[PDB]
C-alpha cells in the first residue's frame, strides 16, 4: 500500500509479488523453504549467479573501505574504463547507475550533437517518460518514432535522412536474424545516420563483446551483463556524439561496492568463459524441453539459445497453464519474456531443471492437444519478449493487421 511504484517482479496468479528470502547460485528459497530454479535472474542481470563468491568477497572488502572510497577516483577505475573500451570499442566511455539513465543521457547527447530532432527507436529503453507513445510510426512529443523493428517504416523515415538524429534499437536475436541486421545496417549507412545500440540486455550476453558484428554502432550501452546485478551501466562510442556527457556527474560515481562488482564481473565476462558455459547448459535445457513438449503434444516451442531464450505458446490460455505448472515445480521463469540462465546453471542444475520440465510436460499433456502453434502465436510471443515485430515474411498489409492486434 505504501509503494507508489509498480516494480516488475515475479507474481503469483493473484498478481501478488512472490517473496524469496535467500538465493545462492541458481536456487532461490521461498518463505516455506521450498527451492526454485531461477531463470529470471534479476531480469538477466545476475549472469554469474546469486551470491557469487568472488564478487561477494570483493564487495565485502569494498564495503570495508579497502578498495577505495566514494569520495575519490580509485586505483581500479582506470582498469574498468580501459577494459570497457577494449571489449566494446569506442572513442570514450561513461558510467551510469541504471540502463534507463544511460539511455536517456546518450540519446539526449546524440540528439544535441546532431542538432536534429527525430529519433527512430525500436525496443525497450527504460522507464523514462521520453519513450512513452500513444501510437507507433509517428513522433511522440519528444520526437521519438517507434518503428517496432519494421524495416519498411524505418526505410521511409530514413528517406528524409537530414531530420533524423539517430536510430536506437535494442537488438533481439531470437526473432531477428542475419537478413534483418544486414538490411538495418545497409539502410542506416545509406542515410548516414548514427546507430545507438541499446545492448543493456544483450551486450556481453553471448560473447566477450557486443551482440552482433553486423551492427556498426556509433554509441553502445551495456549493463545487465556488467556487474552481476549491482547497479552499474556503461556507454561508449564516438566522442563528438557524447560531448554532452561532460555535464554528467552523480554523487555515488565512485561508490566502491558498485565498482568492485563491475570490475570483478567484467574481468570474468571479458574471458568469454561464462557465456560459453551458459550457452552449452542452456542449450541442453532447451533441447530437452522442446523434445518433451513435442512428444507430449503440448503446443509450446522455444526460441533463442542457452544464453537467452523464450517460450512460444499456442495462445495465452496455454501460457497461463504453463506458468502455473512451472511454478508448481519450482521453475521461476520471467513470464512471457526472456529466460537468461547464469553461470551457476551447471550440469547438475540442468538435470534438476529437466526433471521439473518433465513434470510440467506431464501436467499439460492432453489438455491442449488440439491447439496449434500458428504464425499469430509466434508474433504474439515475440512481441511480448522483444517489444516489436519478429522478422517473419509478411506483407505491408499484414504488418498493419499485426500491429493493430498487438498494440497496447
Ligand X SMILES: *Cc1c(COP(=O)(O)O)cnc(C)c1O
Known binding residues for pyridoxal 5'-phosphate are 99-100, 251
Binding status of residue 40 toward ligand X by CB under 6 A: no
Binding partner of residue 337 among a copy of itself, ligand X, Mg ion, none, CB under 5 to 8 Å per kind? Mg ion
Binding status of residue 100 toward ligand X by CB under 6 A: yes
CA–CA separation, 279 and 201 (whole Å): 16
Q: Rounded to the nearest 5°, which phi and psi values hold at 298? A: -85, 120
CA–CA separation, 281 and 273 (whole Å): 13
Whether the Cβ atoms of residue 120 and residue 168 lie closer than 8 Å to each other: yes
Judged by CB under 6 A, the stretch of 123-131, 256-264, 265-273, 316-324 that binds ligand X is 123-131
Binding status of residue 124 toward ligand X by CB under 6 A: yes
Binding status of residue 104 toward ligand X by CB under 6 A: no
Chosen residue from 170, 265, 342, 377 binding ligand X by CB under 6 A: 170
Q: State the residue number with the nearest CB to ligand X.
A: 99
Binding status of residue 195 toward ligand X by CB under 6 A: no
CA–CA separation, 127 and 105 (whole Å): 13
Binding mask 338-377 for ligand X (x = CB under 6 A): ----------------------------------------
Binding status of residue 99 toward ligand X by CB under 6 A: yes
Binding partner of residue 42 among ligand X, Mg ion, a copy of itself, none, CB under 5 to 8 Å per kind? a copy of itself
Question: For the stretch 149-163, what's the b/e string if a residue is b when 16 or more beta carbons lie within 10 angstroms of its beta carbon?
Answer: bbbebbbebbeeeee
Whether the Cβ atoms of residue 189 and residue 215 lie closer than 8 Å to each other: no
Question: For the stretch 301-322, what's the b/e string if a residue is b when 16 or more beta carbons lie within 10 angstroms of its beta carbon?
Answer: bbbbebbbbbbbbbbeebbebb
Judged by CB under 6 A, the stretch of 73-81, 195-203, 209-217, 316-324 that binds ligand X is 195-203
CA–CA separation, 324 and 304 (whole Å): 22
Site residues for ligand X, window 132-151 (CB under 6 A)? none
Strand 308-313 to strand 118-122: parallel, antiparallel, or no bridges (unpaired)?
Answer: unpaired
Q: How far is the CB of 386 from ligand X (least distance, A)?
A: 9
Q: Decide: helix, strand or coil at residue 139.
A: strand
Binding residues: 99-100, 251, 337
Binding mask 112-151 for Mg ion (x = CB under 5 A): ----------------------------------------
CA–CA separation, 326 and 322 (whole Å): 6
Chosen residue from 90, 126, 256, 388 binding ligand X by CB under 6 A: 126
Q: How far is the CB of 139 from ligand X (least distance, A)?
A: 20
Specify the residue, 45 or 289, whose C-beta has the smaller distance to ligand X: 45
Binding status of residue 261 toward ligand X by CB under 6 A: no
Q: How far is the CB of 28 from ligand X (least distance, A)?
A: 20
Q: List the one residue out of 279, 227, 283, 230 whose CA is nearest residue 83.
A: 227
Q: List the one residue out of 27, 23, 15, 39 whose CA is nearest residue 307.
A: 39
Whether the Cβ atoms of residue 58 and residue 264 lie closer than 8 Å to each other: yes
Binding mask 89-108 for Mg ion (x = CB under 5 A): --------------------
Cell, residue 92: 570514450
Whether the Cβ atoms of residue 158 and residue 191 lie closer than 8 Å to each other: yes
Binding status of residue 277 toward ligand X by CB under 6 A: no
Binding status of residue 337 toward Mg ion by CB under 5 A: yes
Specify the residue, 95 or 350, whose C-beta has the smaller distance to a copy of itself: 95
Cell, residue 221: 550501452
Whether the Cβ atoms of residue 270 and residue 87 lie closer than 8 Å to each other: yes
Cell, residue 158: 530514413
Find cell 516489436 and name the residue: 388
Judged by CB under 6 A, the stretch of 73-81, 119-127, 306-314, 399-407 that binds ligand X is 119-127
Binding residues for ligand X, rule: CB under 6 A, are 43, 98-100, 103, 123-126, 170, 198, 200-201, 223, 250-251
Amino acid at each position: 500500500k505504501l509503494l507508489a511504484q509498480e516494480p516488475t517482479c515475479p507474481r503469483d496468479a493473484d498478481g501478488r509479488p512472490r517473496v524469496f528470502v535467500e538465493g545462492s547460485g541458481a536456487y532461490l528459497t521461498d518463505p516455506d523453504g521450498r527451492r526454485w530454479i531461477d531463470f529470471d535472474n534479476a531480469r538477466g542481470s545476475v549472469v554469474l549467479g546469486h551470491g557469487d563468491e568472488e564478487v561477494a568477497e570483493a564487495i565485502a572488502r569494498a564495503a570495508r573501505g579497502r578498495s577505495g572510497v566514494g569520495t575519490a577516483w580509485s586505483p581500479v577505475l582506470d582498469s574498468l574504463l580501459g577494459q570497457l573500451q577494449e571489449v566494446c570499442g569506442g572513442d570514450v566511455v561513461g558510467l551510469y547507475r541504471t540502463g534507463t539513465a544511460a539511455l536517456r543521457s546518450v540519446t539526449c547527447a546524440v540528439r544535441d550533437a546532431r542538432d536534429r530532432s527525430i529519433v527512430l527507436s525500436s525496443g525497450y529503453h527504460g522507464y523514462d517518460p521520453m519513450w512513452h507513445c500513444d501510437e507507433p510510426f509517428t513522433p511522440n512529443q519528444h520526437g521519438i518514432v517507434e518503428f517496432l523493428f519494421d524495416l519498411d517504416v524505418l526505410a521511409e523515415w530514413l528517406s528524409r535522412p537530414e531530420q533524423v538524429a539517430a536510430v536506437v534499437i535494442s537488438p533481439d536475436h531470437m526473432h531477428l536474424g542475419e537478413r534483418w541486421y544486414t538490411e538495418f545496417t545497409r539502410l542506416t549507412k545509406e542515410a548516414d545516420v548514427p546507430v545507438i545500440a541499446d545492448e543493456v540486455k544483450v551486450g556481453l550476453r553471448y560473447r566477450a563483446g557486443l551482440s552482433t558484428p553486423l551492427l556498426d554502432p556509433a554509441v553502445w550501452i551495456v549493463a545487465k551483463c556488467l556487474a552481476n546485478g549491482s547497479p552499474v551501466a556503461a556507454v561508449g562510442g564516438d566522442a563528438h556524439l557524447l560531448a554532452a556527457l561532460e555535464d554528467v556527474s552523480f554523487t555515488s560515481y565512485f561508490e566502491p561496492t558498485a565498482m568492485a562488482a563491475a570490475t570483478t564481473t567484467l574481468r570474468r565476462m571479458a574471458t568469454g568463459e561464462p557465456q560459453q558455459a551458459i550457452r552449452a547448459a542452456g542449450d541442453r535445457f532447451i533441447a530437452h524441453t522442446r523434445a518433451a513438449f513435442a512428444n507430449a503434444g503440448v503446443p509450446i516451442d522455444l526460441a533463442g539459445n542457452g544464453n537467452l531464450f523464450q517460450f512460444v505458446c499456442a495462445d495465452d490460455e496455454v501460457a497461463d497453464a504453463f506458468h502455473a505448472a512451472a511454478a508448481a515445480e519450482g521453475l521461476l521463469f520471467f513470464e512471457g519474456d526472456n529466460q537468461t540462465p547464469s553461470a551457476a546453471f551447471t550440469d547438475e542444475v540442468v538435470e534438476d531443471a529437466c526433471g521439473r520440465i518433465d513434470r510440467v510436460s506431464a501436467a499439460l499433456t492432453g489438455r491442449f492437444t488440439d491447439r496449434e502453434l500458428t504464425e499469430e502465436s509466434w508474433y504474439a510471443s515475440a512481441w511480448g519478449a522483444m517489444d516489436g515485430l519478429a522478422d517473419r515474411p509478411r506483407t505491408r498489409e499484414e504488418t498493419t493487421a499485426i500491429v493493430e492486434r498487438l498494440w497496447e
